[PDB]
């Protein structure tokens, strides 16, 4: 619904970068 909902993708962006970081230090 184009506000709050977006945070769900925010979560994934961060976590994704966090994965890549944890693996490829």
From Swiss-Prot:
Upon acetylcholine binding, the AChR responds by an extensive change in conformation that affects all subunits and leads to opening of an ion-conducting channel across the plasma membrane. The gene is CHRNA1. Pentamer of two alpha chains, and one each of the beta, delta, and gamma chains. It is found in: Postsynaptic cell membrane; Cell membrane. Belongs to the ligand-gated ion channel (TC 1.A.9) family. Acetylcholine receptor (TC 1.A.9.1) subfamily. Alpha-1/CHRNA1 sub-subfamily. The chain crosses the membrane at residues 1-20. This is Acetylcholine receptor subunit alpha. It comes from the Eukaryota.
